[PDB]
Amino acid sequence: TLKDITRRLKSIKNIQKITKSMKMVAAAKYARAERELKPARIYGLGSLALYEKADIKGPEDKKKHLLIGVSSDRGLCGAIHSSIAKQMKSEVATLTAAGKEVMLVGIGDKIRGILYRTHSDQFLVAFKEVGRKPPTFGDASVIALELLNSGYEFDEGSIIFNKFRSVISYKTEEKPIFSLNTVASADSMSIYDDIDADVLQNYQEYNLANIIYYSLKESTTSEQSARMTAMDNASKNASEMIDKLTLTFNRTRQAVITKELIEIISGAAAL
Amino acid sequence: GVGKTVLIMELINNVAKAHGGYSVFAGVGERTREGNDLYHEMIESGVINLKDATSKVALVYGQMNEPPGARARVALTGLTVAEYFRDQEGQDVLLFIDNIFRFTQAGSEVSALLGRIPSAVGYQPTLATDMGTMQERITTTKKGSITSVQAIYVPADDLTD
Numbered sequence: 001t002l003k004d005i006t007r008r009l010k011s012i013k014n015i016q017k018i019t020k021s022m023k024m025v026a027a028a029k030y031a032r033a034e035r036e037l038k039p040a041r042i043y044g045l046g047s048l049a050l051y052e053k054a055d056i057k058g059p060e061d062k063k064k065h066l067l068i069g070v071s072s073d074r075g076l077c078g079a080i081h082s083s084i085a086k087q088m089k090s091e092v093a094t095l096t097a098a099g100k101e102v103m104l105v106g107i108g109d110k111i112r113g114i115l116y117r118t119h120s121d122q123f124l125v126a127f128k129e130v131g132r133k134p135p136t137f138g139d140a141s142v143i144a145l146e147l148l149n150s151g152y153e154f155d156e157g158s159i160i161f162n163k164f165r166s167v168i169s170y171k172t173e174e175k176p177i178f179s180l181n182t183v184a185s186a187d188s189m190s191i192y193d194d195i196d197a198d199v200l201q202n203y204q205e206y207n208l209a210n211i212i213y214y215s216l217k218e219s220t221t222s223e224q225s226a227r228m229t230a231m232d233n234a235s236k237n238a239s240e241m242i243d244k245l246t247l248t249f250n251r252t253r254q255a256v257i258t259k260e261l262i263e264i265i266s267g268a269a270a271l
Numbered sequence: 272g273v274g275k276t277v278l279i280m281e282l283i284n285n286v287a288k289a290h291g292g293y294s295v296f297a298g299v300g301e302r303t304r305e306g307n308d309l310y311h312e313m314i315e316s317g318v319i320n321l322k323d324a325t326s327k328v329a330l331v332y333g334q335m336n337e338p339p340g341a342r343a344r345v346a347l348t349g350l351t352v353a354e355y356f357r358d359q360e361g362q363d364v365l366l367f368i369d370n371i372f373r374f375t376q377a378g379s380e381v382s383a384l385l386g387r388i389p390s391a392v393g394y395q396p397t398l399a400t401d402m403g404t405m406q407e408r409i410t411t412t413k414k415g416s417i418t419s420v421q422a423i424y425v426p427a428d429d430l431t432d
């Protein structure tokens with residue numbers, strides 16, 4: 001039918017326009033994202049420089065656990081939220097199977113949505129309105145505050161995010177987060193001086209905030225890129241469908257002209 | 272199924288009751304059930320008085336089970352009644368034609384066998400000018416007015432038919 005094809009064509013045309021605009025704005029944001037990422041990357045890795053140079057093995061004995069997942073509040077980026085989701089839920093399954101209770105923070109409305117009916121019973125808190133604005137340090141300070149005011153002093157923890165590799169690839173990484181107890185117990189920390197419960201406590205809290213900030217920056221970037229390429233794919237596929245439906249539209253309109261002409265001719269021939 | 276006849280019913284109620292100008296209703300090829308319901312709803316609403324005639328609406332009905340010529344000329348019959356009430360009465364008449372596409376399609380059905388080559392879609396070669404000779408009698412002259420409320424059937428919601 002000619003009018004059906006006309007309507008479907010107009011729909012796919014405005015959809016392709018929408019996806020092209022989204023690709024444009026997503027690339028525009030990704031510009032500033034990867035501009036800000038590099039100094040923040042130097043920063044957030046200089047923070048972990050100690051837990052690297054000290055080789056904190058981690059608690060092999062402790063029971064509870066805290067699991068953070070970094071995402072945004074906007075879908076339509078790709079397999080970002082799905083990747084974080086699958087890794088988080090697999091990891092929770094294997095930790096509860098091993099006799100270790102775990103409770104989970106979700107930064108981003110998307111991860112909370114996609115994992116809430118899955119593991120609501122094992123869930124601490126969630127945060128929203130992350131992803132619209134370029135994440136800053138204030139984000140990390142707030143998330144760390146409500147991670148500490150939670151009263152849930154975790155044995156250990158792991159943050160899960162999408163390490164930005166570059167414009168096309170991202171890797172679901174899991175960074176470790178230690179507690180005061182074993183960072184104090186770690187014999188490697190006997191080379192550092194002037195340390196006791198108080199200063200290690202302050203340092204652990206501030207490093208929690210730092211690693212959350214660096215992870216947010218690693219995830220904001222590595223989402224605008226995924227969104228840009230996904231919208232590129234969407235616009236390309238929409239234009240392919242537009243071309244094929246346009247072929248079918250021309251075919252149908254030629255057939256319509258032929259059919260009406262044959263009607264008129266057969267009607268004239270009966271006189 | 273969009274609500275044309277119920278719309279013309281609302282219009283009949285409000286306008287024809289709030290008017291003093293001898294309305295006319297021309298039923299051009301519409302359902303007999305709806306025509307009977309409209310008649311009986313006009314009677315009980317006082318617009319038609321069977322006793323001591325004070326009625327203010329004249330009804331003309333050429334319905335669906337009639338041949339195409341009848342459904343093509345019943346709109347002209349309604350026209351003629353309203354034209355009397357304007358020409359030789361000075362009144363400002365209302366003319367509810369429902370439905371006029373039935374008039375057009377009855378024209379199509381007469382042209383079918385009237386021995387004439389068909390135009391586009393299937394209508395007559397004489398569609399535009401015959402519907403025009405009909406629709407130009409509906410006008411406001413210096414003698415009176417005929418405001419016409421016409422319900423029009425659009426086949427398959429096309430609007431380009």
Ligand SMILES: Nc1ncnc2c1ncn2[C@@H]1O[C@H](COP(=O)(O)OP(=O)(O)O)[C@@H](O)[C@H]1O
Nearest residue numbers: 272273274275276277278279280305370422424
């Ligand atoms: N007040 C109302 N409440 C419910 N349905 C209504 C009302 N007024 C009109 N309708 C619906 O409007 C639809 C169109 O009726 P009709 O006037 O015969 O359509 P049309 O004249 O456009 O062919 C019907 O399905 C009828 O039930």
Ligand SMILES: [Mg+2]
Nearest residue numbers: 275276301370
């Ligand atoms: Mg109707």
